[PDB]
Coordinates of C-alpha atoms and ligand atoms in Angstrom, one line a residue:
Chain A
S1 CA 366.7 93.2 132.7
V2 CA 369.5 91.8 134.8
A3 CA 372.2 93.4 132.5
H4 CA 370.2 96.7 132.9
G5 CA 370.6 96.9 136.6
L6 CA 374.2 95.8 136.7
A7 CA 375.5 98.1 134.1
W8 CA 373.7 101.3 135.7
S9 CA 375.1 99.9 139.2
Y10 CA 378.7 99.5 137.6
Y11 CA 378.4 103.2 136.4
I12 CA 376.4 104.9 139.3
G13 CA 378.5 102.9 142.3
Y14 CA 382.0 102.8 140.6
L15 CA 383.0 104.4 137.2
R16 CA 381.2 107.6 138.0
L17 CA 383.0 107.8 141.6
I18 CA 386.6 107.0 140.3
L19 CA 386.9 108.1 136.7
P20 CA 386.8 111.8 137.7
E21 CA 389.7 111.3 140.2
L22 CA 391.6 108.7 138.2
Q23 CA 393.7 111.2 136.1
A24 CA 395.1 112.9 139.4
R25 CA 396.0 109.4 140.8
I26 CA 397.9 108.3 137.7
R27 CA 399.8 111.7 137.6
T28 CA 400.6 111.3 141.2
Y29 CA 401.9 107.8 140.5
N30 CA 404.0 108.9 137.5
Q31 CA 405.6 111.7 139.2
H32 CA 406.2 110.1 142.9
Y33 CA 406.0 106.3 143.0
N34 CA 406.7 105.1 139.4
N35 CA 410.4 103.8 138.7
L36 CA 412.4 106.9 137.5
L37 CA 413.6 105.0 134.5
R38 CA 410.3 103.3 133.0
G39 CA 407.6 104.6 131.0
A40 CA 404.8 106.6 132.3
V41 CA 401.4 104.8 133.2
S42 CA 399.1 105.4 130.3
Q43 CA 396.1 107.6 131.2
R44 CA 392.8 105.5 130.9
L45 CA 391.1 102.9 132.8
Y46 CA 391.2 99.7 130.7
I47 CA 388.3 97.4 131.3
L48 CA 388.1 93.9 130.1
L49 CA 384.9 92.5 128.9
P50 CA 385.1 88.8 128.3
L51 CA 381.6 87.7 126.9
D52 CA 382.0 84.3 128.2
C53 CA 382.2 85.9 131.8
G54 CA 385.5 83.9 132.5
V55 CA 386.9 86.6 135.1
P56 CA 389.8 85.0 136.8
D57 CA 391.0 87.1 139.7
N58 CA 394.8 87.0 138.6
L59 CA 395.3 88.6 135.0
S60 CA 398.5 86.5 134.8
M61 CA 396.2 83.5 134.7
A62 CA 394.6 84.8 131.3
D63 CA 397.8 85.6 129.9
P64 CA 401.6 85.5 131.2
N65 CA 402.5 88.4 129.0
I66 CA 400.0 90.5 131.4
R67 CA 402.1 90.9 134.6
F68 CA 401.3 93.0 137.8
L69 CA 403.5 96.0 138.6
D70 CA 402.0 98.1 141.3
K71 CA 399.0 99.7 142.7
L72 CA 397.7 103.5 142.1
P73 CA 397.4 105.4 145.6
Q74 CA 394.1 104.2 146.6
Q75 CA 390.8 106.5 146.6
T76 CA 388.7 106.6 149.7
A77 CA 385.1 108.0 150.1
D78 CA 382.3 107.7 152.8
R79 CA 379.6 105.7 151.2
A80 CA 376.3 104.3 152.4
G81 CA 377.2 104.4 156.1
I82 CA 381.1 103.0 155.4
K83 CA 383.6 105.6 156.4
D84 CA 386.5 105.4 154.1
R85 CA 385.4 103.0 151.6
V86 CA 388.5 102.1 149.7
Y87 CA 388.7 102.2 145.9
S88 CA 391.9 100.7 144.7
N89 CA 393.3 99.8 141.1
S90 CA 396.2 98.0 139.9
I91 CA 398.9 98.8 137.3
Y92 CA 399.9 96.1 134.8
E93 CA 402.8 95.9 132.3
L94 CA 402.0 94.3 129.0
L95 CA 404.7 92.1 127.3
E96 CA 405.6 91.8 123.6
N97 CA 408.4 89.3 122.6
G98 CA 409.6 89.5 126.3
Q99 CA 410.0 93.2 126.4
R100 CA 407.6 95.8 127.9
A101 CA 405.2 97.3 125.4
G102 CA 402.7 99.0 127.5
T103 CA 401.9 100.1 131.1
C104 CA 398.2 100.7 132.0
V105 CA 395.6 100.6 134.7
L106 CA 393.8 97.4 133.7
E107 CA 390.8 95.2 135.6
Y108 CA 387.9 93.0 134.7
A109 CA 384.4 94.3 134.9
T110 CA 383.5 92.7 138.1
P111 CA 379.6 92.5 137.1
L112 CA 380.5 89.9 134.7
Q113 CA 381.5 87.5 137.7
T114 CA 378.0 88.1 139.0
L115 CA 376.6 86.8 135.6
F116 CA 379.0 83.9 135.6
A117 CA 377.8 82.8 139.2
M118 CA 374.3 83.3 138.4
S119 CA 374.6 80.7 135.7
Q120 CA 376.1 78.3 138.3
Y121 CA 373.6 78.7 141.1
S122 CA 370.2 76.8 140.4
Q123 CA 368.5 79.1 142.7
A124 CA 369.2 82.2 140.3
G125 CA 367.2 80.4 137.7
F126 CA 369.7 81.8 135.0
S127 CA 371.0 79.7 132.2
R128 CA 374.3 79.8 130.4
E129 CA 372.3 81.1 127.3
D130 CA 370.7 84.0 129.5
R131 CA 374.7 84.7 130.6
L132 CA 375.7 85.2 126.9
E133 CA 372.9 87.3 126.4
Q134 CA 373.0 89.6 129.3
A135 CA 376.7 89.8 129.1
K136 CA 376.3 91.2 125.6
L137 CA 373.5 93.5 126.7
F138 CA 375.5 94.6 129.8
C139 CA 378.4 95.8 127.6
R140 CA 375.9 97.6 125.2
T141 CA 374.1 99.4 128.1
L142 CA 377.4 100.4 129.5
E143 CA 378.6 101.8 126.2
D144 CA 375.3 103.9 125.9
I145 CA 375.8 105.2 129.3
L146 CA 379.5 106.2 128.9
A147 CA 378.8 107.8 125.7
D148 CA 376.7 110.5 127.3
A149 CA 378.6 110.4 130.8
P150 CA 380.1 113.8 132.0
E151 CA 382.5 111.5 133.8
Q153 CA 384.9 111.4 128.7
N154 CA 388.2 110.0 127.5
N155 CA 388.8 108.2 131.1
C156 CA 388.3 104.5 130.4
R157 CA 388.4 102.0 127.4
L158 CA 386.1 99.1 127.0
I159 CA 387.6 96.0 125.7
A160 CA 385.1 93.5 124.8
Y161 CA 386.1 90.1 123.3
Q162 CA 384.8 86.7 122.6
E163 CA 387.3 83.7 122.8
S169 CA 395.6 81.5 119.4
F170 CA 393.8 84.3 121.2
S171 CA 396.2 86.7 123.0
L172 CA 394.5 89.2 125.6
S173 CA 397.7 91.1 125.8
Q174 CA 397.7 91.7 122.2
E175 CA 394.0 92.6 122.7
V176 CA 394.8 95.4 125.4
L177 CA 398.0 96.8 123.2
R178 CA 396.0 97.3 120.2
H179 CA 393.7 99.5 122.2
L180 CA 396.6 101.0 124.0
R181 CA 398.6 102.0 120.9
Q182 CA 395.5 103.7 119.3
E183 CA 396.5 106.6 121.7
Chain B
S1 CA 364.7 91.8 136.7
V2 CA 366.7 94.7 137.6
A3 CA 366.2 93.8 141.3
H4 CA 367.1 89.9 140.6
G5 CA 370.6 91.1 139.0
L6 CA 371.2 93.4 142.1
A7 CA 370.5 90.9 144.7
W8 CA 372.6 88.2 143.2
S9 CA 375.4 90.7 142.9
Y10 CA 375.0 91.9 146.4
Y11 CA 375.4 88.3 147.6
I12 CA 378.1 87.0 145.2
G13 CA 380.1 90.0 145.1
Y14 CA 380.0 90.9 148.8
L15 CA 378.1 89.1 151.5
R16 CA 379.4 85.7 150.4
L17 CA 382.9 87.1 150.7
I18 CA 382.9 89.0 153.9
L19 CA 380.2 87.1 156.0
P20 CA 382.7 84.2 156.5
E21 CA 385.5 86.6 157.8
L22 CA 383.2 88.8 159.9
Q23 CA 383.2 86.7 163.2
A24 CA 387.0 86.8 163.3
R25 CA 387.1 90.6 162.5
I26 CA 384.7 91.5 165.4
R27 CA 386.5 89.2 167.8
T28 CA 389.9 90.7 166.8
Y29 CA 388.5 94.2 167.0
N30 CA 386.7 93.3 170.6
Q31 CA 389.9 91.9 172.0
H32 CA 392.8 94.2 170.6
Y33 CA 391.1 97.6 169.5
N34 CA 387.9 98.2 171.3
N35 CA 387.9 100.4 174.5
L36 CA 388.8 98.2 177.5
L37 CA 386.0 99.7 179.6
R38 CA 383.2 99.6 176.9
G39 CA 380.8 96.9 175.5
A40 CA 381.7 94.3 172.9
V41 CA 380.6 95.0 169.3
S42 CA 377.5 92.7 168.6
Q43 CA 378.2 89.9 166.2
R44 CA 376.3 90.3 163.1
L45 CA 376.4 92.6 160.1
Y46 CA 373.3 94.9 160.4
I47 CA 372.2 95.8 156.8
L48 CA 369.8 98.8 156.6
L49 CA 367.0 98.4 153.8
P50 CA 364.9 101.6 153.4
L51 CA 362.4 100.6 150.8
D52 CA 362.1 104.3 149.7
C53 CA 365.9 103.8 148.8
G54 CA 366.9 107.0 150.5
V55 CA 370.7 106.1 151.4
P56 CA 372.5 109.0 152.9
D57 CA 376.2 108.2 153.1
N58 CA 376.3 109.3 156.8
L59 CA 374.1 107.5 159.2
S60 CA 374.2 110.3 161.5
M61 CA 372.3 112.2 158.9
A62 CA 369.2 109.8 159.2
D63 CA 369.3 109.6 163.0
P64 CA 371.6 111.5 165.5
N65 CA 371.3 108.8 167.9
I66 CA 373.3 106.6 165.5
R67 CA 376.9 107.8 165.7
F68 CA 380.2 106.5 164.1
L69 CA 382.8 104.8 166.6
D70 CA 385.4 103.0 164.7
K71 CA 386.4 100.6 161.9
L72 CA 386.9 96.9 161.9
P73 CA 390.2 95.8 160.7
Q74 CA 389.9 95.7 157.0
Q75 CA 389.6 92.8 154.7
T76 CA 391.5 92.4 151.3
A77 CA 391.3 90.0 148.6
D78 CA 392.5 89.8 144.8
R79 CA 389.4 90.3 142.9
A80 CA 388.9 90.5 139.0
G81 CA 392.5 92.0 138.4
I82 CA 392.5 94.3 141.5
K83 CA 395.3 93.1 143.8
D84 CA 394.4 93.7 147.5
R85 CA 390.9 95.1 146.8
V86 CA 389.7 96.4 150.3
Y87 CA 386.6 95.5 152.2
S88 CA 386.0 97.9 155.1
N89 CA 383.2 98.0 157.5
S90 CA 382.0 100.5 160.2
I91 CA 381.1 100.2 163.9
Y92 CA 378.2 102.4 165.4
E93 CA 377.0 103.0 168.8
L94 CA 373.2 103.4 169.3
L95 CA 371.8 106.0 171.7
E96 CA 368.8 105.8 173.9
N97 CA 368.0 108.5 176.4
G98 CA 371.6 109.9 175.5
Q99 CA 373.2 106.8 176.9
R100 CA 374.8 104.0 174.6
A101 CA 372.2 101.2 174.3
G102 CA 374.3 99.0 171.6
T103 CA 377.4 98.7 169.4
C104 CA 377.1 96.9 166.0
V105 CA 378.5 96.9 162.6
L106 CA 375.9 98.9 160.5
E107 CA 375.7 100.0 156.9
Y108 CA 373.0 100.7 154.1
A109 CA 372.6 97.9 151.5
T110 CA 374.4 99.7 148.7
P111 CA 372.5 98.5 145.7
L112 CA 369.6 100.5 147.0
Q113 CA 371.6 103.7 145.9
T114 CA 371.7 102.2 142.2
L115 CA 367.8 101.8 142.3
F116 CA 367.5 105.7 143.6
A117 CA 370.0 106.9 141.0
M118 CA 368.2 104.9 138.1
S119 CA 364.8 106.5 139.0
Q120 CA 366.6 109.9 138.7
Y121 CA 368.5 109.4 135.3
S122 CA 366.3 109.7 132.4
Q123 CA 368.6 107.2 130.3
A124 CA 367.8 104.4 132.7
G125 CA 364.0 104.4 131.7
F126 CA 363.2 103.8 135.5
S127 CA 360.2 105.3 137.3
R128 CA 359.8 105.9 141.0
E129 CA 357.1 103.3 141.0
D130 CA 359.7 100.7 139.4
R131 CA 361.9 101.9 142.0
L132 CA 359.4 100.9 144.9
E133 CA 358.7 97.7 143.3
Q134 CA 362.2 96.5 142.7
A135 CA 363.3 97.5 146.1
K136 CA 360.8 95.3 147.7
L137 CA 361.9 92.5 145.2
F138 CA 365.6 93.2 145.9
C139 CA 364.8 92.7 149.8
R140 CA 362.8 89.5 149.0
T141 CA 365.3 88.0 146.8
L142 CA 368.1 88.7 149.2
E143 CA 365.9 87.0 151.8
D144 CA 365.5 83.8 149.7
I145 CA 369.1 83.8 149.0
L146 CA 370.4 84.0 152.5
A147 CA 367.7 81.7 153.8
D148 CA 369.7 78.9 151.8
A149 CA 373.2 80.6 152.0
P150 CA 375.9 78.5 153.7
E151 CA 377.7 81.9 154.4
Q153 CA 374.2 81.8 158.5
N154 CA 373.5 83.9 161.8
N155 CA 376.1 86.3 160.2
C156 CA 373.8 89.1 159.4
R157 CA 370.5 90.8 159.9
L158 CA 368.3 92.5 157.4
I159 CA 366.4 95.6 158.5
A160 CA 363.6 96.4 156.0
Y161 CA 361.5 99.5 156.6
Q162 CA 359.2 102.1 155.2
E163 CA 359.1 105.5 156.6
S169 CA 358.1 110.0 164.3
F170 CA 360.1 107.1 163.0
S171 CA 363.4 106.3 164.9
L172 CA 366.0 104.4 162.8
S173 CA 368.2 103.9 166.0
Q174 CA 365.0 102.4 167.8
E175 CA 364.6 100.1 164.7
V176 CA 368.0 98.9 164.9
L177 CA 368.1 98.5 168.7
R178 CA 364.9 96.2 168.3
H179 CA 366.8 93.8 166.0
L180 CA 369.9 94.1 168.3
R181 CA 368.2 93.3 171.4
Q182 CA 366.5 90.1 169.9
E183 CA 369.8 88.6 170.6
Ligands
1SY1 N1 386.5 96.5 140.1 C1 385.8 97.2 140.9 N2 386.4 97.9 142.4 C2 385.6 98.4 143.4 O1 386.0 98.8 144.3 C3 383.9 98.1 143.0 N3 382.9 98.5 143.6 C4 381.8 98.2 143.1 N4 382.2 97.7 141.9 C5 381.0 97.3 141.2 O2 380.2 98.4 140.8 C6 378.9 98.2 141.1 C7 378.1 98.9 142.0 O3 378.9 98.8 143.3 P1 377.9 98.7 144.6 O4 378.6 99.4 145.6 O5 376.8 99.7 144.4 O6 377.4 97.2 144.7 C8 378.4 96.4 145.5 C9 378.3 96.6 147.0 O7 376.9 97.1 147.4 C10 378.8 95.6 147.7 N5 380.1 95.7 147.8 C11 381.2 95.0 147.1 N6 382.3 95.4 147.6 C12 382.0 96.1 148.7 C13 382.9 96.9 149.7 N7 384.2 97.1 149.7 N8 382.1 97.7 150.4 C14 380.8 97.8 150.4 N9 380.1 97.2 149.6 C15 380.8 96.2 148.8 O8 378.6 94.4 146.7 C16 378.1 95.0 145.6 C17 378.6 94.2 144.4 O9 380.0 94.4 144.5 P2 380.9 94.2 143.1 O10 380.5 92.7 142.8 O11 382.3 94.3 143.2 O12 380.5 95.1 141.7 C18 380.1 96.4 141.8 C19 378.8 96.7 141.3 O13 378.4 96.1 140.0 C20 383.5 97.7 141.9 N10 384.3 97.1 141.0

């Protein structure tokens, strides 16, 4: 299925490559680049999974209580003929009552953008019903993979359907640690 | 199908983003960073499509007459919550009789790595026969998409099955311009 390929590619070409190196990048940030006076960046990669596949490129567009703070040091690797391909991730603060309530590495699962665009291009032969069905199946397959992935406590999938506060959704997952 | 999703994601999340900006990056390279005395980098993105999905990360491993030269200036974009996600491409020289016969931006289609890894992981339920069939279907769907893609003369798909000279394969496509 469409979702089966996208979930395996998200693992093979991304999570399995960056998750083993993420803990070290966060520590390096927390000790060398973070503000001396502010809270540490939390430890896991938080992955947003809107089942409606609405993926703005700016998180502050989805919720103004999610605001960009800084970048981790980037990770590079030679990949499929590209020397020093760059993997970069962004740190966000999460506001509650106008005060910072959390700091974490946060991003949307980019394959949901593919599902959305496929539902929009007639040549893809892919309906909005297909989109919802495959979005769900993508999340479930990714869950399946990560349950047995040796690359373990390194990320958190935040699946949701849409008075909805995305920042409150992330905070609920954050505060479970 | 698996290949249908991977081909649409390769277009939507990569080719359609970098191909409109590639001509300008090559010109900037040719005028500012290229050796003053050497040939210009050719104009299109050459994409290698081994149907056996064997995708080494170092092209010099597939053919010693393909050797890394330099990187284009990188392209950055805000993407799905990642500030300044980096798109980078690498320039290769192509040797014939130990002399340089061409200079071009060259890389493997990374989704073929996903197909290969899926054939190797039992949890993917994906056979080596599936791999060949979907590799072919991935290439054909990508061909279909690009035939009508407004983002036109900007890349060249090099599909091949494996006394085979990869550098000679690329040169044949290069010299058709
Ligand atoms: N958040 C995030 N940051 C990343 O760096 C990243 N890289 C991949 N992904 C997703 O992982 C999966 C596997 O990536 P793969 O490289 O095999 O396919 C990629 C790859 O073949 C190509 N591509 C995209 N960006 C680049 C890039 N910088 N360099 C080379 N190829 C790229 O186009 C495909 C789809 O890209 P994305 O649509 O962004 O989603 C991918 C995909 O779902 C990423 N997701």
